[PDB]
């Protein structure tokens, strides 16, 4: 009777929190573009359609986006995929050479400067004995002055080599699905209002995440997943001004960007079986690549985020905006990759406003760099080939990244500024809803039964 | 006969409910445990980690009284100094997630008790069939 006996139970549904590796998998349409032209099909099992997303009752768990793991391995994995997509492509060693340059043929006003320089130089042919004289075009942000005459050299040829990307492999993102291996599960908070920390009362488990498209952008993150109703701000410690502020807003706002100059590529040969792509003639007028957004939608969404931001700082507060304070190139402006070419576009025209306590379109001008260096690795510079024809691209602005100014000395206004910083925050805008947990079977409980001899 | 009855849920589906209702389904929580160019190394070490964990659990269950019963009982009496709970409340009140934080202190001893109990029972029945 009162001699209760222990009983072991295998497969009790219970878990703990843990950390492990994960699993990369995408759809079957990515295999139609054959022969690994897109990346993430070297290492991708095709996803199985309609995975289970099972719902749960009463059980309530707490989440934390800020000490969350698996974002770190995502930031590792994208870098590793980027590096694996380059070693089968050609090096650009014999290109570091003395360049004879001049201005392009254009009726130039004297005070404006040329954005294009026109250079000619020597290059080895297929044989070793012949050498030829050839010409091409470059942007001003790639050549510098070596020091009568006037001659230049490339910017990177004093610290590193340079690798050209292959023109086969594309750059557009594709929906990467993450999945857990056998013996774990991924939880998901389905609550409508959950700022990013604490308990969530309606959970659901899952085996694989939704579609995630990895895009690289510094401010004003693109093609993201908007929230349901309101505009949500999230931060780690708000009164601390060291941490960024992530703003996810509800309705997407359209953005256009375009480069209008018609371009002609040209194939120089370096030697045996080595191709190289210059930028040949320019058919048309030299215009400037730019971006358009609508006026009133932008003003209305900024009114939305002011109305939501006022709750975290008291109602009677003047709030204003300002452009970026300074630093290197790709953090003042915002920067992205459209059509297989990289844009750096000035954003000072959008963040100039002040807000009291109670048809036309905005343009902004951009610049074009040909060589890039993402992640600021110490010996890794990447060239990018030019493309053909007029380029334009349409997208949805979805979120924002902000930073409070550390204002002491008794001022009621609280200015805000955009700041790019890490690349990790763009993934943290999408993995704010998943923690990974580990199954544990074999519970043990007392009850009234006893094993016979 | 049945217009609308509770059919079954996915694995960890019942885990919010009480333990008495959750004990009706274990096979679902048991089956989803085995199965359903540097990356191949990560997949292979994931798979062998999975089978290593499952084999450890099978061996640890094998050294007690029940190899493959999936529900066992044994001959170790419950000491009430661990749990201080009534019988009437636990099967109709609490969840396993709620249970595990309560019984977290008294672990790693009960396992050794089961080991010694199974060992002594095996040697005594060995002596019984020895005189048989």
């Amino acid at each position, epitope marked *: 009777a009162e001699n209760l006996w222990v009983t072991v139970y295998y497969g009790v549904p219970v878990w703990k929190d843990a950390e492990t590796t994960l699993f990369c998998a995408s759809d079957a349409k990515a295999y139609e573009t054959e022969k690994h032209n897109v990346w993430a099909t070297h290492a991708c099992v095709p996803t199985d359609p309609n995975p289970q997303e099972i*719902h749960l*009752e009463n059980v309530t768990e707490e989440f934390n986006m800020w000490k969350n793991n698996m974002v770190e391995q995502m930031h590792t994995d994208i870098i590793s995929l980027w590096d694996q997509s380059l070693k089968p492509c050609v090096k650009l060693t014999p290109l570091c050479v003395t360049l004879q340059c001049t201005n392009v043929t254009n009726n130039i006003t004297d005070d404006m400067r040329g954005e294009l320089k026109n250079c000619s130089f020597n290059m080895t042919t297929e044989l070793r004995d012949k050498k030829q004289k050839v010409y091409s075009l470059f942007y001003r942000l790639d050549v510098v002055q070596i020091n009568s005459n006037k001659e230049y050299r490339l910017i990177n040829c004093n610290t590193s080599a340079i690798t050209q990307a292959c023109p086969k492999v594309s750059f557009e993102p594709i929906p990467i699905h993450y999945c857990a291996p056998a013996g774990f599960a991924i939880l998901k908070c389905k609550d409508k209002k959950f700022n990013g920390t604490g308990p969530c009362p309606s959970v659901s488990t899952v085996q694989c995440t939704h579609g995630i498209k990895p895009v690289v952008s510094t401010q004003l993150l693109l093609n993201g997943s908007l929230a349901e109703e309101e505009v949500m701000i999230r931060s780690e410690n708000i009164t601390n001004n060291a941490k960024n502020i992530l703003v996810q807003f509800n309705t997407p706002v359209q953005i256009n960007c375009t480069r209008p100059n018609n371009n002609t590529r040209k194939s120089i040969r370096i030697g045996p079986g080595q191709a190289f792509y210059a930028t040949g003639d320019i058919i048309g007028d030299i215009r400037q690549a730019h971006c358009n957004v609508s006026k009133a939608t932008w003003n209305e969404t900024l009114g939305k985020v002011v109305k939501q931001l006022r709750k975290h700082f008291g109602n009677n507060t003047i709030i204003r905006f300002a452009n970026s304070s300074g630093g290197d190139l790709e953090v003042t402006t915002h920067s992205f990759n459209c059509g297989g070419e990289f844009f750096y576009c000035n954003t000072s025209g959008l963040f100039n406003s002040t807000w009291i306590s109670n048809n036309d379109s905005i343009t902004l001008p951009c610049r074009i760099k040909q060589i890039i260096n993402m992640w600021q690795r110490i010996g890794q510079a990447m060239y990018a080939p030019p493309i053909q024809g007029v380029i334009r691209c349409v997208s949805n602005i979805t979120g924002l990244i902000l930073t409070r100014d550390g204002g002491s000395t008794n001022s009621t206004t609280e200015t805000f500024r955009p700041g790019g910083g890490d690349m990790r925050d763009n993934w943290r805008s999408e993995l704010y809803k998943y923690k990974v947990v580990k199954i544990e079977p074999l519970g043990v409980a007392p009850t009234r039964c006893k094993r016979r001899v | *006969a*049945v217009g609308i009855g509770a059919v079954f849920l996915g694995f960890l589906g019942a885990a919010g409910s009480t333990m008495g209702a959750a004990s009706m389904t274990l096979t679902v929580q048991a089956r989803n445990l085995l199965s359903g160019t540097v990356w191949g190394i990560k997949q292979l070490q994931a798979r062998v980690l999975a089978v290593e964990r499952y084999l450890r659990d099978q061996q640890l269950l094998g050294i007690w009284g029940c190899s493959g019963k999936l529900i066992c009982c044994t001959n170790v009496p419950w000491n009430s100094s661990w749990s201080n709970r009534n019988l009437s409340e636990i099967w109709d009140n609490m969840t396993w997630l709620q249970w595990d934080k309560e019984i977290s202190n008294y672990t790693q001893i009960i396992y050794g008790l089961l080991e010694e109990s199974q060992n002594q029972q095996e040697k005594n029945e060995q002596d019984l069939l020895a005189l048989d």
Partner: antibody
Amino acid sequence: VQLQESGPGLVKPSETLSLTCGVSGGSISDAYYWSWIRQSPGKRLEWIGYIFGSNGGTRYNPSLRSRVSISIDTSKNQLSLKLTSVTAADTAVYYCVREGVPTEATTGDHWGQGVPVTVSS
Amino acid sequence: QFVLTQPPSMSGAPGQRVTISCTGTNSNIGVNYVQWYQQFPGTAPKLLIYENYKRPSGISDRFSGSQSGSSASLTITGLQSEDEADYYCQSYDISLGAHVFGSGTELTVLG
């Protein structure tokens, strides 16, 4: 075992509709499920919730889970439904049902007669 | 939105044999039991088929039921004039965690 419905047919907006389901010929404590079903205009059928007869364990639709509550009183042999802050989508006909015996020659499910409930100002 | 899809209306001569198909996904039909219900207009519904092929007492063996994959089917052999009604398929779904109904099918008997 017969099932019948009771309550006001008209509810003001943002208020709480209440329903009483009266059962004859049997106990409410029996090992059976008791469920509420509503039917919108256009005959859109929608499950609300159910509660087991013996111990009273509940399961609702999650999509309305904030505003719905179901209770049982064995003393009056009655089922009770409460829905707070009703709006125009909740105009519906309401039935309360018992699941039926798991035997060979059952009558099938056991249906109520129904109450029509209008949300209006 | 209904996670269970049916064609909305169908008609047939008396004595005919028809098949009403209920179409859903694996996550609800493929693991659970499905039921077939009958209601007249202005009338509380009645169970016809429970557990995909079985009929309770009080109901004739005139109807038959089958289930395959993510689809269910009821078959009427020898349609009678009484069967002008609305029929529904119903099951339980994991992903919503809820019982769900079909699109509804109004059987209007010809003749």
